[PDB]
Structures are given as C-alpha cells and as structure tokens.
Subunit: 336 residues, 4 copies
C-alpha cells in the first residue's frame, strides 16, 4: 500500500535520511541502533553540529522516537539477523552502519523480515544505482538488495553522463577534495587498513584511495576503462568537491560545456544536477539536496579537448536525499 | 640493576612516553598494542602530526621496534593478563590504554610479571602522584600500582601548592580550556556516557566534567573541600590552559603572586612549574616538558583577595615526561 | 513617522543587522561601505559561511541593493562626514565599522544628517545600553549617540542582573571562551596593539583582555568594583560562552539558581535570557536570537556561596538582533 | 666580498627567510617593516605558530634585532624608496611585502641603494627563476630585479622537468590543494578583486585561480601551451600539495615514473626534489626544505599514458629556503 522505511545505523546518513524522509513525507516505521537508546536518539536527531536544530518536534515515549507526531519504533540490535523487521511490517531497510556491505551480509535483513535493502555505500557485489543515471536498470523481481553508491559517485556520475553524451570522454582522472567523516580520527590513531586515515583529521590534508570514479563506469558501462581517481580528505566537517580532468573526443569549448550542463540541469536531471556561475565556496552547499552542483567559473580548459570540470556536493545531505529518492523509486516499480 | 620499562597502549601518551624515555636515556624493553604490528608502530612512532618527525632512526626487524639502535620487543595482546612481561624481565609498566584504570584491572599486569604499574590517568582507587607535589608519599613496599593523575591535575596541583602555601586558598574553581583528544569524535557520533563528547570536536566548544580539580585535593589534602572545576574542549589538537579563580586568605597583590611563582619555578619546582611574562599563545607550548607554565600577563585580579590565575600545559608532552619522571623516581626509591 | 535605518560598515554585524531588520520588519534605507559595491553587496549578503544563504531574494539595480523587493541605497564613503544621510531622510544609523567608537568620531554622522547613532561596540564615552538591563536609562532628548556594548556584555549583564537581584554578587571574575572574529589573522601577523591577537586564529587558544565584565558594572552600577574578567579566543567561527565564577551573599543552592534563571527567562527577560538543561555545545546556538542562554548542566558549585555559571551567546546573531531591538526602542521613546 | 641581505616585509616569508639565512650562514644586515618595531620583531621571530620557537637567541638593543649575536639593523619605512639600503652597504634585497611585484615598483629599491632585488612572488615582468630548473638563465650583467616564482611553481616545475625530459608531456592540468595564507580572512569579509578569497579561511574549501602552472611554461619554455591549473584553499595553516594530471608521449608505467623521480632526487635535483614511498600526510612536511616531495603511493595511473602525479611542499619553509638558495646563486654569478 505505502512505502514504509526502517533505518539500520542512526549515524550521519541514518539521521539525515530520517530528516529527508520527513521533508519528503516518507513513513519511517523503525530505527535500529545498538548504541543509541530512544531518549538519546531524540538528542542526536534534534541537535546537529553541521545542519542545525531539527525544525519540528522531537520526543520519546513508550520506547519510541516521536518526530512531528509520527511514532517510530526503536530497536537496539547489534546484528541485522537480530532486528525484528516483521514487527513493523516488512519495511524497506536502509543499511547505513557501514559494516554490512555485501549481498551476503545484507541479506540477513531480508531473512529478519525486510522487504528490500538499500546499502548506503558501495557494495562489492550488490547492484549499484545513481538516481538520474541508471535507476531504470533496477529490476523489481530480481534485486532485493541494492547499493546507492557513494556520495562521490553520485556527484561524478551525473556530470560524467552529460559530458560523455555530448562530447565523448576519451579518458578521465578525478580528484575529490572531501570533508572528513566518522571513519577518521581526531588525533593520530590506529587505521591498520589505511594508515593515512588514522592521522588527525583536523590537522591534515590526507590522500586516500577511493573506488568512486571507477564506480561511475559500473553505472555508465560505456565509460569502462576510462575513469579512475583518488581523494584528499581535508579539515572541513561537510561538503566536498569533484575535480574531473578529462580528455574529450569532440571539441568542447567551455561555453559549449556550460550550455550542455545547464540544459541537463533544467531538464532530464532537474533535482540531481544543478548549474551555478556564482562565486561559491563549500559552506554555500550545506543542506543542498542536489547530487552534483557544477561550478562554471571554478573550472579551467587547457584547450577544447582537455578540461578540468568542478562540481560540488553536500556528501551528507545530498546523498541522504538520494537514498530516499531511490527508496521511493524502488517502491513505485515494485508495484509491477 | 636498571630501570626497564614496558608500555601498554601505544597511543598519544604511549608513543610520547617512548619519545620522553629516549630523550631521558630510559630503557624501554617492550611495547604491547593489539592494534599496531611492529612495522606499523615504526610509522606511527616516526611521523607525528603534532610533534613532528622523530629525530633519530626508527626501524623494525625480527618482530621488534628499533629506535636509535635500541631493540624493543613488540607484543599484540588485547588484555594485560595475556602480556608476557616475564619474557622481558619484570619491567615497570606504563598502562596507557585508557581502559584499565582500577587497582583490580591493573593488577593483571603484576600477575603477568610486571614489577610495577603506572596508570597514565586518574584511578578510582590507585594512589595518585604529581611530581613536584606529593611524590614523597610513594611507599616502595606497599604500592605496586600507582596513578600519575591527569594532565590537568599536573598543571593545577603545582600552581595550587605554591599559591596555597604563600597566600592560603580559601576556595577555588577551575576551568580548563582543553585541546581535543582521542576519546572525541570527528563528526557528531555516539558518546552514551557523556553526550556532549560525541559532538564534532573540530566544530564545537564542548563543556565537559572533569575530576581534575578535586584530584588536586587528594594530592594536597589540606585543599580538601576547597577546589573543583570543569572543562571546555575546543578545536586545537594539543596544548591546554588552566584558569584558576580563587579567593585567597592573605593579601595577594599580583606582583606578590608573581614573586612566589618565579621563586618556586627557579627552585623547588624547577622543571615542573615554569614562569613566563611573554605574550604567549597555545602553540608556543608544543613540546614543552613542564607540567605548568604560569602566564603572568594573562591573569587578572579583582582585588588582593580574589584573582584569576592562568597556566599552560602541553597535555600530551608534559604529561608524558612526568610519567617518565615518576617511573625513575619510583625506581630509585624501590632500591630500599 | 517610521523607524528608518542606515548601516555604516556592512561586515559581520552590519550584514546580520540587515538580516535582523528584514526578520523584524524594520526599514533599512541605506548601507554605506567603501569596500563593497552594490553587486558585491548582493553576493556578501546572499551567501554566509556561518549562517547559510539568505532565505529571500537579493538583487541589485540602479546603484541599489534589493532585498525582498525593498530597495536600499548604497553609498561608498570612507568617512562618516562624507555619507549623505540627508538624502535618505535622517535615518537612525548603525555604526558598525569598528573604527568610529567615541562620541566625537560618531557625531560626524549627526552633522552628515543622521537622526541617531548606535555604535555596535563599547565606546570610551557614549552611554552604553543592554536590552533587558538598563534600556530605560536612555533619554530621548539628550542622547544622540549611544553604544549597544559588546556581545560579551550582552551575555553577562542579564545573567548578572538576575543573580545579583536574587542572591547578591559579592565579587565575580569572568572568562569568555570566544570565537575568532574579523580583527584576528589567518596566520601569524602584525597586531602591534595586542601582540597575541596577531597569532594564527585557527591554530591557537589566545588569551585576550576584554573590558566586557567591567562594562556590566557600568550598566548595573550597583556592581561597581565587583566584576572583571578576560577572554580566550579559540578556533570556532561563531558562538561564544561566558563562564562567571562568583561569590554570592545569600545561600544559592544550584536548584535555587536555576529557578531564578528560568523565572527571569519566562517573564521579565523573555527573548533576552533563555534557560536550557539540554546537553548543548556551541553549534547549537548558531542563529539563536537570545542575548544569553544559561546552561544549567554545565555549571558547577563548590558550595552554596561560590559557583561557576555558564551561559552561551551567538556573538554575531544575538548581538545583531539587540542592535535592532535597541533601535526600535530608541524610536518608540524618541516619540516623546 | 660577501653576500649580505636585506629583507623588506617581515611576514611569513620574510621571517622564515631570516631563519633560512641563519641556518645557512648567510648575513642578513637589515629588515624593514613599517608595522613591526624592533622589540616586536624579537617576539614575532622567536615564537611561531607553525614552525616552533626559534632555536637560538633573539634580542633587541640600540634599534637592532640580534639573532644569535648577529646584529641586524631595523628600519620602519612604508615604501621601498624610503629605505636606507646604502646605510648597510648595498645588500641583496628580498622583496617580500606582497605589494611591489613589477620591475618598476621594485626598482625603487635599486635607486634606494640595493644591489639586487629578489621578489618573493611571481612578477608581471621581472624574470622568473626556479632553483634546479632554470637558474642558469640568470644574467649577472642585465638582471637587477628577478622573481623566485611562487611556492606552487617551485613544486610543479622540478617534477614537470623530470617527467617531461623522460616521457614527454603532451598536456597537463594541475590542481593544488593549498593551505590558507595571510591574504585570506578569518571570517567572511571583503575581497573585491577575488570574492571567494574573502570567505572564511577556516570554514571553507575555496576555489582560486593561480598562474602557477602556466608559470612553469615560462621557466620551461618547451611546455608553452601545455600546462595550466587552478587551486583549492583549505583549512590548514601550512603545507600544500600538487596534483598534476598529465598525458604523456612515451609509455610511462608507474614503476618507470618512480625510477625517473628517484634518480633526479638522488642526483641533479638533490635538495630540490625529494622522493618518498611512506604513507605521508601534510604535517609530515612541516619544516621540510625541499621544493617538491613526490609521493609515490598517492598517485594513480589510468594507463601508461595518462597519470595523476602527487607532490608536496611546505609553501612557507621550502620556498623561503629557495629564496636564500637563489640569493646565494645570484651572488656567486655576480662575481663575473
Ligand atoms: N557521511 C558521508 O558523507 C557518507 C556518504 C555516503 C555514504 N556513506 C556511508 O554510509 C555508511 C554510514 O556512514 P556514516 O558517515 O553515517 O557513519 P557513522 O559513523 O555516522 O554511522 C554509523 C552508525 O551506525 C551505528 N552502528 C555501528 N555498528 C552497528 C551495528 N553493528 N548495527 C547497527 N548499528 C551500528 C553507529 O552507532 C553509528 O551510529 C558508511 O558505509 C559510509 O561509507 C557516508
Ligand atoms: N592525550 C592526553 O592529553 C592525555 C593526558 C593525560 C592522560 N591521558 C590518558 O592516557 C590514557 C591514554 O590516552 P591517549 O590520549 O593516549 O588515548 P589513545 O586513544 O591515543 O591511546 C589508546 C591506545 O591504546 C590502544 N588500546 C586500546 N585498547 C587496548 C587494549 N585493550 N590493550 C592494549 N592496548 C589497547 C589503542 O590502540 C591506542 O593505540 C587515557 O586514560 C587518557 O585519559 C591522556
Ligand atoms: N563579530 C562579533 O562577534 C561582534 C559582536 C559585537 C560587536 N562587534 C563590533 O562590531 C564592530 C564591527 O564588527 P565586525 O565583526 O562586523 O567587523 P567586520 O570587519 O566584519 O566588519 C567591518 C566592516 O566595516 C567596513 N569598513 C571599514 N572601514 C570603514 C569605513 N571607514 N567606513 C565604512 N565602512 C568601513 C569593512 O568593509 C567591513 O565590511 C566592531 O566594533 C566589533 O567590535 C562584533
Ligand atoms: N606564505 C606562502 O605560502 C608564500 C609562498 C610563496 C610566496 N609568497 C609571497 O610572498 C609575499 C609575502 O607573503 P607572506 O605570506 O609573507 O605575507 P605576510 O602578510 O605574512 O607578510 C607581509 C609582510 O609585509 C609587511 N608590509 C606590508 N606593506 C609593507 C610595506 N609597504 N613595506 C614593508 N613591509 C610591508 C607586513 O607588515 C607583513 O609583515 C607575497 O607576495 C606572497 O604571495 C607567500
């Protein structure tokens, strides 16, 4: 009858997914987090260092979180298999813990009663979707567990689609200058799997690997072999920027690039890709719901066939809105 | 024969304790950390965001850390009881994990072969020592497990001793404006035991409780009932400041306060308490080995009996040196 | 007929005063800033690193700034005497440049045609007002040029008034942990008048003098001789906190302190002083319009007569609102 | 007889140039800064937020700065033409104010008695030099006034020279993720010439233009038309990184790129270009004297002909050393 949602992991993305759901009239029926009891959830949801106080009412009673009079069951389970999704009637589950990334790890939600799962991160094997790029690849009958890619991939893929369809990308290399996140440390500490990520996040420009540019070639297969990249983590709490250096097949004077991006923004990618010529900086995108905001004046061309294109994203807020848009899209299609 | 040391928990304090030991010719024979293998220890020890590259040679071989040609056994045990302290011959153990604070929790080191333990933090029950204040209270025959207090207590106690002995402290209230630490978060996340400490460390002035001012009254009993305080955590990676507002028994014109602090610095507290009149700010104390640096010009008096006194400390580096000074003192006394 | 306002110096305060004036329906008829032409004023007004995009329309035409269809004359004069206030019909002028602080310096606005001047900072000699504390001391016939004090004074004075009137303040010493401002530097540079204020704002805890605590004894003369204080500047862009350590005449158990503050907040100081028991940190007060937000749980008492009281303020936003409230009050009273 | 130096503008570069000169035994005979009297110069020189306390003695007497017993005349002139260079016997002048960039502007030093001028920034017209790249283009008889380029150019040019000479650069596009500097603001303020640079430095990723990548094609003319780039300013106080995305003529497997860079570092560019494979972040280069430190593991290749190369630089310290190396080179050659 209606889209109902459950959120596993009430972190940055989990909480801002809940905000996005409220803004978009999507029913959340449960939140599970083992480290956050209902009264503490109220606090964490209401006050936000980056995105301000929640505009609305937040309370708890009866082991529930109450947002603007909508009651939300709260569970405290450490593993997906333990979560009582059947109790709240087979909701679509957002898997936002960061620790259950494979189809196998995620499927424990399905066996615990979830109708679908959207992993809020890239998956080694779940099929991957970027709204505005390949969401039509979703198959209601055969895809119980999907991935909504990364924030970075949601920024690059829409831009890469427009540039590729208009000019042809021969080859590209991406850098994202990216805000620090929850996986990083306040001071130099242990990160055995990626030593540089242990270094103090507030003190350092930190190079990091990312699969996000390659991930674009999974959602736009015709770019296979033509894109990769890396990241720098820097001392800002939110908002990131993509810097795509690409070699183009057809002549691409910069005025022609701008006309293509503007047309995409105003039409087939309205709400996903935005276009600006203002003299913006990162804080200007706090709370912006777009996946990718093309910065006309920040980019530079060496010539008509070799350009550096710049596009912003609120990696927390934009991505969280895409999770909700993907959920809603899945549901309309699952009515087939 | 000689002081030998083992370090449990190769974090900020563990690593800077090792630096301090090298600077002071103290033999470290083992480091245990379950999350840091020998080759990774080399990296973590050599490069430091706050205190620069280690000036010397750092390498590994044979499952050992080699600092300036001194070989250090590396263990990888998750619990004190598992650590083979007997293997390296009953060393004095620095317990710097932050998780083994009681006499009971710490004593597992003794049963695993440690001669003594210095907990690098306040303890609910271990006796507590501040070099320059009460280290003579140490009893070789009856104190296997001690605490070296907190960084803040090592800053306040020496100042409080001088002011109290010269003027009489009727009552005092302390604020420490304190750098963020490893227990804090890069972005708003879970801190169930102290909700405010979960809020993004780089973004916020964060009020926090601290027992450090009261802890001064344990190491200077005559101040019992006369001191307490609180903290603000702020967006700096190291160096903190004590702001002691006190009501004094005898007239204390500020010139008289300065003469007392200077005399203590030049004599009975040389190396522990320092005195400055320069126009300093926090970065000026990076790497400073003193427990407490009195800032003459930052303080203000309402009158001769009510004053606000300001004193700095490198909470990482100064404290780490005091751990080493306490170890060395214990050892000279344990020869009795 | 109506309150009309001119702003001299379209900086942090100047711009946020315009925001406050729009929010409160107060007519701004001109802005003067020699370093900001109208088109640039649109940009600076529209986008704000700390307080988000202006919610409304911002444009320029005909050498005017147009905010939500209200047209604002823009002047570009380097000195008050040069500004054509007569042209926009004798407005009340906000003097927010930071450089015209005395009666003598500010009186050039009056001779250039301003009806009144409110200096957005303490003055060596203009009379000083804190809304909710002493605004009734304003005399329409004899005070052309007034001061609205500092952000810090506006935070401390209302709290001090409540505490003094209920319990009696014997003596007090204040610290404010304060966000950096426009007078500070990005990296170590020249500050000949106050050397510490030249040191990098983002890197340091910086001790600073402030007359703000003494200024409270100007606006509450019964506190003369009983209050002073100092400041620490820290690496946050906005929001500050007052820490008042005070000896009280009547017993003041903390529960009684809280009832006094809550009753003031609900009644005679509604909108000026607020009361909270939530686990707040500084970002929680971004955009808060109160002069003072008492933090119940952050404060600490040594005993019933010696307490540390903690109160927050958005130094930029709250203060800017008080400028507008003072303008509006001056005008209703100037109708006499 | 000997190289003697005068510094105009005792800022970040000016002060660190004096540090470099002490480290390298180069005689500084005068410093001019109108905003810094001798006693204040002691303070600014002695204490440094980013590079620690000066290791040595710093004092003033007789209107002189005394660093390690070397006496330095201090002048206080607002314009080059006013400075008494003749009084200290025709020194080589470092022009580090940021405001006298042209041949015409800088030539007032020559007529005020300077033997040579090195402008510590790019010039619209002075010839430009990068040590290790084109210093041999200097002509003692015809070049009174030269430029030492920018920090960024000094990082990119040596790397570009190596890569171009080994593999051929077809085309390249550079991004530098760059620490904030003295021209930026603590909070959103006026930057009429470049609006984005006015936005709060500590809060934002800020896109900026830079001529630095083009400037490399001035110092390596064979790259004309083949290189340009842009910048992001980010919230770190010092140390920056170059990200060069380039198409190469000959196949360049990454292993071959690394051997070329290592062989340059060990040989013809010893001291200018360094090579690392450690897991470094920006603070790891504080105080590093190299112009360029190639980060082997941070770079990424799409294929053998399309690569992203990553190289670090302490924009303050490394560049300052190059000023001193250029002075010393100019002098040995001026003996002709
Ligand atoms: N923050 C961003 O910019 C962003 C953007 C896109 C994708 N992502 C991805 O979203 C996922 C979550 O990221 P985040 O930034 O919200 O991290 P976070 O640390 O803020 O979120 C983790 C939350 O999940 C909880 N949790 C941990 N283990 C759990 C378990 N076993 N069961 C239930 N809950 C558990 C934690 O309490 C925490 O509240 C990660 O894969 C991350 O890569 C993050
Ligand atoms: N950093 C300071 O300013 C400071 C000052 C005084 C006291 N302290 C105290 O020192 C203690 C350590 O603080 P820190 O700042 O070094 O924290 P940290 O996070 O830097 O140190 C923790 C280290 O111990 C390791 N560890 C965790 N659990 C372990 C276990 N079970 N067995 C062995 N090792 C384990 C972690 O890998 C980490 O390397 C804490 O009690 C802290 O309160 C810190
Ligand atoms: N920011 C705060 O937290 C705060 C709070 C309370 C009071 N104040 C006071 O408000 C005053 C302004 O503060 P701010 O933070 O907005 O500073 P700011 O530097 O942000 O604003 C100053 C503005 O004045 C302009 N200006 C400079 N000289 C001028 C002149 N001669 N004529 C006209 N305009 C000129 C500049 O262009 C700039 O836009 C200062 O006295 C400050 O002490 C600031
Ligand atoms: N900081 C870096 O990373 C860096 C690197 C390479 C080049 N540069 C260039 O070096 C030059 C100086 O840079 P900075 O970062 O040291 O700036 P800064 O602002 O730190 O130093 C400028 C100094 O010049 C002084 N000054 C101003 N006007 C003067 C005048 N008329 N006469 C004499 N002194 C005057 C100021 O008092 C200040 O001490 C600029 O051109 C800058 O582009 C900077």
């Amino acid at each position: 009858r209606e889209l109902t949602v459950g959120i596993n992991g009430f972190g940055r993305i989990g909480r801002l997914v809940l905000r996005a759901c409220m803004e978009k009239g999507v029913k959340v029926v449960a939140v599970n987090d083992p480290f956050i009891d209902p009264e503490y959830m109220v606090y964490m949801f209401k006050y936000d260092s980056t995105h301000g106080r929640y505009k609305g009412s937040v309370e708890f009673r009866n082991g529930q979180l109450v947002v603007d009079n909508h009651e939300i069951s709260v569970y405290q389970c450490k593993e997906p298999k333990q979560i009582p999704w059947r109790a709240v009637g087979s909701p679509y589950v957002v898997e936002s813990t960061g620790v259950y990334l494979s189809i196998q790890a995620a499927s424990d939600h399905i066996s615990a009663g979830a109708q679908r799962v959207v992993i809020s991160a890239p998956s080694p094997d779940a099929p991957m979707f970027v709204m505005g790029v390949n969401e039509n690849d979703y198959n209601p009958g055969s895809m119980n567990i999907v991935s909504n890619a990364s924030c970075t991939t949601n920024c690059l893929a829409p831009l890469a689609k427009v540039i590729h369809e208009r000019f042809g990308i021969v080859e590209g290399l991406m850098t994202t200058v990216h805000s620090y996140t929850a996986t990083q440390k306040t001071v130099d500490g242990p990160s055995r799997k990626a030593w540089r990520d242990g270094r103090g996040a507030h003190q350092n420009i930190i190079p990091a690997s990312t699969g996000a540019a390659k991930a674009v070639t999974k959602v736009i297969p015709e770019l296979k072999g033509k894109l990769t990249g890396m990241a720098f983590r820097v001392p800002t709490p939110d908002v990131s920027v993509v810097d795509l250096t690409c070699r183009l097949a057809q002549p691409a004077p910069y005025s022609a690039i701008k006309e293509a991006v503007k047309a995409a923004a105003k039409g087939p990618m309205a709400g996903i890709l935005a276009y600006t010529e203002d003299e913006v900086v990162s804080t200007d995108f706090l709370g912006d719901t777009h996946s990718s905001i093309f910065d006309a004046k920040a980019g530079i061309a060496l010539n008509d066939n070799f350009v550096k294109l710049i596009s912003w994203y609120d990696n927390e807020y934009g991505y969280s809105h895409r999770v909700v848009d993907l959920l809603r899209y899945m549901f309309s299609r699952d009515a087939e």
